[PDB]
């Protein structure tokens, strides 16, 4: 329904999976939007194809809303609802205060809602990280940047391997399993949950083995007991150092009993035992949950 003529560009915001995002306002309605601008020879990039067609299907208060696609022959423009900042930039600003527990709780809860909705609609996000989780001044957090997402089938088949930013990448991808699923998005969320509490990345590795070993040193090296099939996975090595699992109360010390229970389910090695977003919503961690406005900005 749109035309570039009604938007006033306001400032550049950044560069996500592809193209570029600017803050802009609609001159006629007043509405602040984010414009993603796509320069168009492979024609329309698979990322834009995926993002657009999947985002069209996903209309949910915890998924960023695609308002419109303005479709020139030179340029493709995605008009999104505007959100005020991302989770990473918010964690930095809470540097001294810390984020208050009820905000962590509300954001996780909301994130699990948005993920549950994606999984329910056969969509994998595959790039959950603080830079792609956007917050508004009313207390909403929302999943954004679906350029890496995809429509899966039941049961899944082999999909791209090079997937999820390293720090947030699940062990089954690190170990080269030919099948991965919804559980990969949960891993990411688990990591981010840890991160919202400590204000620092849980597994900040610099390479894939460094990533595994950091994961291994916290959750203990997995074996056939904890995770049947591991020792048969393509990139599994019998030479891996074998670390004892650490007590969770030391992984994320400020977390209470319910918090810890939740994170451990979110971080189970075996994708089949890893909690689902759907199931996670009913967890006793969330029993007193509310939706406070962000204590800052």
């Amino acid at each position: 329904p749109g035309s570039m003529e009604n938007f006033q560009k306001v400032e550049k915001i950044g560069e996500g999976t592809y193209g570029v995002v600017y803050k802009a306002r609609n001159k006629l309605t007043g509405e602040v939007v984010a414009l993603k601008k796509i320069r168009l020879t492979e024609g329309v990039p698979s990322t834009a194809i995926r993002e657009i067609s999947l985002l069209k299907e996903l209309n949910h208060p915890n998924i960023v809303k695609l308002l419109d696609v303005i479709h020139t022959e030179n340029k493709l423009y995605l008009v999104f609802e505007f959100l005020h900042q991302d989770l990473k930039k918010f964690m930095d600003a809470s540097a001294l205060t810390g984020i208050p527990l009820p905000l962590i709780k509300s954001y996780l809860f909301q994130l699990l809602q948005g993920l549950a909705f994606c999984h329910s609609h056969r969509v994998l996000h595959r790039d959950l990280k603080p830079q792609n989780l956007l917050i508004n001044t009313e207390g909403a957090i929302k999943l954004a940047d679906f350029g890496l997402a995809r429509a899966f089938g039941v049961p899944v088949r082999t999909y791209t391997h090079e997937v999820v930013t390293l720090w947030y990448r699940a062990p089954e991808i690190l170990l080269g399993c030919k099948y991965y699923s919804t559980a990969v998005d949960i891993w990411s969320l688990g990591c981010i949950f840890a991160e919202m509490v400590t204000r620092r990345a849980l597994f900040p590795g610099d390479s894939e083995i460094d990533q595994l070993f950091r994961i291994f040193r916290t959750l203990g090296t997995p074996d056939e007991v904890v995770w049947p099939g591991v020792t048969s996975m393509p990139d599994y090595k019998p030479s891996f150092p074998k670390w004892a699992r650490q007590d969770f109360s030391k992984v994320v010390p400020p977390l209470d009993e319910d918090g810890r229970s939740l994170l451990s389910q979110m971080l189970h090695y075996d994708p089949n035992k890893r909690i689902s977003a759907k199931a996670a919503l009913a967890h006793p961690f969330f029993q007193d949950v509310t939706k406070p406005v962000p204590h800052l900005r």
């Binding site: 020879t41 492979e42 024609g43 329309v44 990039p45 698979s46 194809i49 995926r50 657009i52 067609s53 999947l54 069209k56 299907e57 696609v69 479709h71 022959e73 999984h119 329910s120 609609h121 056969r122 429509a151 089938g153 039941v154 049961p155 088949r157 082999t158 999909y159 791209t160 919804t182 689902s276 759907k278």
Partner: protein, 253 residues
């Protein structure tokens, strides 16, 4: 998520359904020219070792595009190429490059890319369509136990349906997939559309019957059909050479 996804797909397949009549409204192209095109797409898929889902998606795109855009026979292939390009870009880990599509067709690269954008507009970017393949794959989980020949035979019959607009435009992916699954499982094991799938889908042999009669004919007539890329394709070991099995003579319905 198995039930939520299935429910969601049952809703989309209605919204994603082409106009049953469309070919009668096309001045210049016929059911039989679409069959040639689809048969060709099958070759492209085998040449480039594309997923079966990809092919299914392309056919969905072409039918929908053709439901609202009137096309001349000299262009039908242009549409098909772009459709297959978009399906590859959506579905494949490694889509063939634009160049490879230009080469398999002549139209220029500029034409292919312009058509691609046209198809996106006409489809308003709604590319995540349910397919016979997505349904079958779910149905397969109800085999006791899994049998590879049943799966490949079902996929084969499902695919065969892409070729003939009449009659298959009138049936929804989830229904063709059910006829295919029953037909395959019967041909190979003598077993039937199982109870558990009645619970899942709501379909019975009675509701499946119409499509099932058409499928059983398509099957028996398959060696004779002017189009043969699917039969050829399914001689491959990869699909257990199911296209060499004999169709049953009767269904006992």
């Amino acid at each position: 998520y198995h039930e939520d996804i299935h429910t969601y797909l049952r809703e989309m397949e209605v919204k994603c359904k082409p106009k049953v009549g469309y070919m009668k409204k096309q001045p210049d192209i016929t059911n039989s020219m679409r069959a040639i095109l689809v048969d060709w797409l099958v070759e492209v898929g085998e040449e480039y070792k594309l997923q079966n889902e990809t092919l299914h998606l392309a056919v969905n795109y072409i039918d929908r595009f053709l439901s609202s855009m009137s096309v001349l026979r000299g262009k039908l292939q242009l549409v098909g190429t772009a459709a297959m390009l978009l399906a590859s870009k959506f579905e494949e880990i490694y889509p063939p490059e634009v160049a490879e599509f230009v080469y398999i067709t002549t139209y220029t690269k500029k034409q292919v890319l312009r058509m691609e954008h046209l198809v996106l507009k006409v489809l308003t970017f709604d590319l995540a369509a349910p397919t016979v393949n997505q349904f079958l794959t779910q149905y397969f989980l109800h085999q006791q136990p899994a049998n590879c020949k049943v799966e490949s035979l079902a996929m084969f019959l499902g695919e065969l349906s892409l070729i003939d607009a009449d009659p298959y435009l009138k049936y929804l992916p989830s229904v063709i997939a059910g006829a295919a699954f029953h037909l395959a499982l019967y041909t190979v094991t003598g077993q039937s559309w199982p109870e558990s799938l009645i619970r899942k889908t709501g379909y019975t042999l009675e509701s499946l019957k119409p499509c099932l009669m058409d499928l059983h004919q398509t099957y028996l007539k398959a060696p004779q059909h002017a189009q043969q890329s699917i039969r050829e394709k399914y001689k491959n070991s990869k699909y257990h050479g199911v296209s060499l099995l004999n169709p049953p003579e009767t269904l006992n319905l």
